[PDB]
Amino acid sequence: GLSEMRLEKDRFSVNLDVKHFSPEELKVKVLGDVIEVHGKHEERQDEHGFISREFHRKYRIPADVDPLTITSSLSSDGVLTVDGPRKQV
Amino acid sequence: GLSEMRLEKDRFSVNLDVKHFSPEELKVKVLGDVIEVHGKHEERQDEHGFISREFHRKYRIPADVDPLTITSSLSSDGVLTVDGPRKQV
């Protein structure tokens, strides 16, 4: 899954779809214990002229996971991985 | 195809995805010979907490199709059909 959120045994990791747009339109934001990855693909040609996929990907941090230990990372394939180990780690 | 634009023999018809959101967030707009169906699904729970699908579905009207003859229609299944016959019709 390249769009899945899951707290592992003792580690919080997330994959996210950023295949067709860029850091410039990918607004990875957080709000305390919140992770709002406001992604966006503008000028998106498809089956009907242009569209856009503007996201508000607001998912929260488990109470047992430290926001500060969570780090995002965007691959060349366009997969944004937001992952921080538990507070226990 | 429920998201396909195609000028038929002599008739312009479009299907569009509006399965998970409503006329209130579905901003069917046009700009002259342009059809910008700025759709939007906010508060969209998925594999990672909430997201949103805010669209800018800007596809243009064939020069042989009358904008005035194009009418949209949203089904109970959440399919928006934007369809107007040619100017020839």
From Swiss-Prot, chains A, B:
One of its GO terms (biological process) is negative regulation of DNA-templated transcription. Its main location: cytoplasm. One of its GO terms (cellular component) is cell surface. Zn(2+) 1 binds at H20, H48, H56. Keywords: Acetylation, Cardiomyopathy, Cataract, Chaperone, Cytoplasm, Disease variant, Eye lens protein, Glycoprotein, Lysosome, Metal-binding, Myofibrillar myopathy, Nucleus, Oxidation, Phosphoprotein, Secreted, Zinc. Zn(2+) 2 binds at H41, E43. Belongs to the small heat shock protein (HSP20) family. May contribute to the transparency and refractive index of the lens. Has chaperone-like activity, preventing aggregation of various proteins under a wide range of stress conditions. In lens epithelial cells, stabilizes the ATP6V1A protein, preventing its degradation by the proteasome. It is linked to Myopathy, myofibrillar, 2: A form of myofibrillar myopathy, a group of chronic neuromuscular disorders characterized at ultrastructural level by disintegration of the sarcomeric Z disk and myofibrils, and replacement of the normal myofibrillar markings by small dense granules, or larger hyaline masses, or amorphous material. MFM2 is characterized by weakness of the proximal and distal limb muscles, weakness of the neck, velopharynx and trunk muscles, hypertrophic cardiomyopathy, and cataract in a subset of patients. Cataract 16, multiple types: An opacification of the crystalline lens of the eye that frequently results in visual impairment or blindness. Opacities vary in morphology, are often confined to a portion of the lens, and may be static or progressive. In general, the more posteriorly located and dense an opacity, the greater the impact on visual function. CTRCT16 includes posterior polar cataract, among others. Posterior polar cataract is a subcapsular opacity, usually disk-shaped, located at the back of the lens. This is Alpha-crystallin B chain. The chain holds residues 64 to 152 of 175 of the full protein.
